[PDB]
Amino acid sequence: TAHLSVVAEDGSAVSATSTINLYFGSKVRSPVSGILFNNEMDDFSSPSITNEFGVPPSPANFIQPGKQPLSSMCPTIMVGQDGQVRMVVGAAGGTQITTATALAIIYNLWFGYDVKRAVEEPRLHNQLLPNVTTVERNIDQAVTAALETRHHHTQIASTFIAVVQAIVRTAGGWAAASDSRKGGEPAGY
Amino acid sequence: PDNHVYTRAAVAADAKQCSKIGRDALRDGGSAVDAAIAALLCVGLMNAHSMGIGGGLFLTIYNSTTRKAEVINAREVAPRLAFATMFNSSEQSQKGGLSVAVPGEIRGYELAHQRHGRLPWARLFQPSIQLARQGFPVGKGLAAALENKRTVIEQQPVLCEVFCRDRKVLREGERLTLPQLADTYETLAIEGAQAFYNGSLTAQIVKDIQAAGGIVTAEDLNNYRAELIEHPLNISLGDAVLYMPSAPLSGPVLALILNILKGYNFSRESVESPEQKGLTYHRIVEAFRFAYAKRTLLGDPKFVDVTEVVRNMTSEFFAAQLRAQISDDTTHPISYYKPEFY
Numbered sequence: 001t002a003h004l005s006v007v008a009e010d011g012s013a014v015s016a017t018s019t020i021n022l023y024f025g026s027k028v029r030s031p032v033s034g035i036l037f038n039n040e041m042d043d044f045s046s047p048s049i050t051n052e053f054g055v056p057p058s059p060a061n062f063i064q065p066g067k068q069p070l071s072s073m074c075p076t077i078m079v080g081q082d083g084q085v086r087m088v089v090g091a092a093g094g095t096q097i098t099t100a101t102a103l104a105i106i107y108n109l110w111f112g113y114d115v116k117r118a119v120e121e122p123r124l125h126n127q128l129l130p131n132v133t134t135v136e137r138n139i140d141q142a143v144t145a146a147l148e149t150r151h152h153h154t155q156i157a158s159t160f161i162a163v164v165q166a167i168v169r170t171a172g173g174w175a176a177a178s179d180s181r182k183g184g185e186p187a188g189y
Numbered sequence: 190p191d192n193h194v195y196t197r198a199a200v201a202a203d204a205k206q207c208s209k210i211g212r213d214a215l216r217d218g219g220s221a222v223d224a225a226i227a228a229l230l231c232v233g234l235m236n237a238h239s240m241g242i243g244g245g246l247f248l249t250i251y252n253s254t255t256r257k258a259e260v261i262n263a264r265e266v267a268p269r270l271a272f273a274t275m276f277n278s279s280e281q282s283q284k285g286g287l288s289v290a291v292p293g294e295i296r297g298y299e300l301a302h303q304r305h306g307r308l309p310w311a312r313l314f315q316p317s318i319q320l321a322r323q324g325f326p327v328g329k330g331l332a333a334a335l336e337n338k339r340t341v342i343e344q345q346p347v348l349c350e351v352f353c354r355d356r357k358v359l360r361e362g363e364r365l366t367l368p369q370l371a372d373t374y375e376t377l378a379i380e381g382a383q384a385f386y387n388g389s390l391t392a393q394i395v396k397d398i399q400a401a402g403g404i405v406t407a408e409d410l411n412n413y414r415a416e417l418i419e420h421p422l423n424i425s426l427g428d429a430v431l432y433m434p435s436a437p438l439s440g441p442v443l444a445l446i447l448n449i450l451k452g453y454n455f456s457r458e459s460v461e462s463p464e465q466k467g468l469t470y471h472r473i474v475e476a477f478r479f480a481y482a483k484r485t486l487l488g489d490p491k492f493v494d495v496t497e498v499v500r501n502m503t504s505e506f507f508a509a510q511l512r513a514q515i516s517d518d519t520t521h522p523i524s525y526y527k528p529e530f531y
C-alpha cells in the first residue's frame with residue numbers, strides 16, 4: 001500500500017490509496033515490461049488457510065471470479081459545512097491502515113495536534129484477533145501502563161505501525177505532512 | 190519539528206520527489222486528479238515495493254465547485270478462472286502467478302483523468318519516465334523493504350536484475366534505475382491505457398503471469414473496468430462530513446470506530462493528564478475491538494449482500510449501543526464483542 005493526499009488551489013482534493021498488497025507483490029516481475037505484479041489474491045479468505053490461531057475463514061470474503069477482495073485501505077476526505085476541505089488523509093501498512101487513519105483524525109480533530117504531529121505521533125493497534133494491543137516504541141509509557149492495568153496485553157512493534165500522509169486546512173493555508181516512518185516529504189506552493 | 194504550510198496548494202506523497210512531481214503538475218495548471226496521477230506514477234518507482242501499475246487503487250475525489258465527492262474503484266479483481274478453493278496454503282496465495290489479481294491501476298488513472306483531467310495524459314508520465322531512466326537514490330522505505338525481503342529478492346534473478354547491486358539488495362542511497370518500466374510508461378503515455386488492457390502490452394502481461402503459474406487471460410484484461418461510485422460512504426462528525434469508500438474497502442470500519450468514539454467528546458483535555466490519557470487510549474482500543482468484530486461480515490458488495498451490515502456500521506445509534514458496552518476499567522474476551530461471520 002501507498003497513500004497520497006492532494007489539494008489543488010481551487011479547493012478540490014484527492015485522497016488516493018494504491019497497492020500491490022505485500023512487499024513486492026507476487027514477486028513476479030516481467031523481464032520485458034518491468035511490471036511488478038500484485039498478490040492481491042492473498043487478501044481473500046480461503047476455506048483451507050488458517051492465518052491466525054483459532055480464527056475461522058470469512059465466507060463473505062471468499063474468492064469468486066470477478067470479485068474484489070476485502071481491503072484495509074480507506075482514503076478519506078473531510079469537508080466542512082461551508083464546502084471547504086478540512087482534511088485529506090489515509091494510510092498504508094496492511095491491517096493497521098484503518099486504525100492509523102482513525103488515529104490521525106482523532107489526533108488532529110479532537111486532541112488538537114497539528115498535522116505533522118498527528119502524523120508523527122505514536123500509534124497503537126488492535127484488530128480483536130490476535131488478542132493483543134501493539135504499541136509503537138515511543139508511545140507515552142503511561143498509556144502502556146493504563147492499558148495493562150485494564151488487562152490488555154501489549155507488545156511493542158518491532159518496526160512501526162502504518163504510514164500516514166495528510167493535508168489539513170489552516171488559517172495559513174494548507175498544512176501538509178508525510179510520514180517519517182517511510183521517508184516522505186510534501187511539496188506545494 | 191518538521192512543518193510544511195502552503196498558501197495555494199499541496200501534495201503529500203510518501204517520497205519528496207513524487208510530491209514535487211504532483212506539485213509541478215498543479216503549478217502547470219493540472220487538476221488535483223492530474224497531480225495525483227503524476228505523483229502515483231512516481232511512487233510506483235520510488236516505492237515500487239508498495240504500489241504500481243501492476244496493482245490497483247481507490248481514489249476519493251472532491252470537487253469544490255459542485256461540492257460533491259465521488260469514489261473511483263480500480264481495485265484488482267479475481268480472474269475469470271479463479272475459484273474459492275484454488276489455494277491450499279498461504280504461500281500459494283502470496284507468491285507466484287496464481288497470487289496475481291487483474292490489475293486495475295491504469296484503468297483507474299484513465300477513468301479519473303477522463304472525468305477530471307486538465308493536462309494531457311502523456312504529460313502525467315513524462316517526469317516519471319525521466320526518473321526511471323536517470324535513476325534515483327533508494328529511500329528509507331524501499332531500503333527497509335529490500336532488506337526485509339532480501340532472501341526472496343536475491344534468489345530471484347528477474348528481481349535482482351533491478352533491485353540488486355552485485356547480487357545483494359540495494360542499500361539506502363544507492364542508485365536504482367528502472368529502464369524497462371520507463372519504456373512501459375512511455376508506451377502508456379503515447380498509446381494510452383488501452384495499451385495495457387487491449388493493446389501492445391497485453392499479450393506480454395498474460396505471458397508473464399501465466400509463465401509464473403497464473404491464470405489471468407487476455408479476456409480478463411480486456412473486460413476489466415474501473416467503477417465510478419457517485420455516492421461514497423459518509424459520516425457526519427460535528428459540522429463536517431467524512432467521505433470514504435464502502436466495502437470492499439474499510440470505510441465502514443473507520444466509520445464505526447469514529448462514531449463509537451465521538452460520543453466521548455474527546456478534546457485536548459482527554460490527553461492532559463496520565464489518568465485522562467490512559468482512559469482515552471483504552472476507549473480507543475475498545476472501539477477498535479468492537480469495529481473489527483463486525484468487519485468479518487464485509488466483502489465485495491456485488492457478490493455479498495452487506496447492505497444491512499454497512500448500515501449498522503455507519504449508524505450513530507448502533508455505535509452508541511457498542512459505546513455503552515465499553516467498560517472504563519477493563520477490556521474483555523473476544524466473544525464479548527460478538528464477532529460475526531454470518
Ligand SMILES: *[C@@H]1O[C@H](CO)[C@@H](O)[C@H](O)[C@H]1NC(C)=O
Nearest residue numbers: 048274275276277278281287
Ligand atoms: C488446492 O486443492 C484443491 C482441491 O484439490 C485444488 O483444486 C487446487 O488446485 C489446490 N491448489 C493448489 C495451488 O495446489
Ligand SMILES: *[C@@H]1O[C@H](CO)[C@@H](O)[C@H](O)[C@H]1NC(C)=O
Nearest residue numbers: 220252253254255304305306
Ligand atoms: C468540477 O465541477 C465543475 C462543475 O460541474 C466542472 O465544470 C469541473 O470540470 C469539475 N472539475 C474537475 C477537475 O473535474
Ligand SMILES: *[C@@H]1O[C@H](CO)[C@@H](O)[C@H](O)[C@H]1NC(C)=O
Nearest residue numbers: 386387388389391392407411
Ligand atoms: C482487444 O479486444 C478485442 C475485443 O475486446 C479482442 O478481440 C482483441 O483480441 C483484443 N486485443 C488484445 C491485444 O488484447
Ligand SMILES: *[C@@H]1O[C@H](CO)[C@@H](O)[C@H](O)[C@H]1NC(C)=O
Nearest residue numbers: 258420421422423424425430
Ligand atoms: C451521506 O449519507 C448518504 C450517502 O449515500 C446520503 O444520503 C447523504 O446525502 C450523504 N451526505 C453527504 C453530505 O454527502
Ligand SMILES: *[C@@H]1O[C@H](CO)[C@@H](O)[C@H](O)[C@H]1NC(C)=O
Nearest residue numbers: 497498500501502506507510
Ligand atoms: C443492526 O443492529 C441491530 C441493533 O441495533 C441488530 O439488531 C441487527 O441485527 C443488526 N443488523 C445486522 C445485519 O447485523
Ligand SMILES: *[C@@H]1O[C@H](CO)[C@@H](O)[C@H](O)[C@H]1NC(C)=O
Nearest residue numbers: 131151152520521522523524
Ligand atoms: C483476550 O484478552 C483478554 C484481556 O486480558 C482476556 O480476558 C481473554 O481471556 C483473552 N483471550 C480471549 C480468547 O479473549
Ligand SMILES: [Cl-]
Nearest residue numbers: 002003092203
Ligand atoms: Cl505510503
Ligand SMILES: [Cl-]
Nearest residue numbers: 034367369370
Ligand atoms: Cl525496470
Ligand code: NA
Nearest residue numbers: 177191192193
Ligand atoms: Na511537515
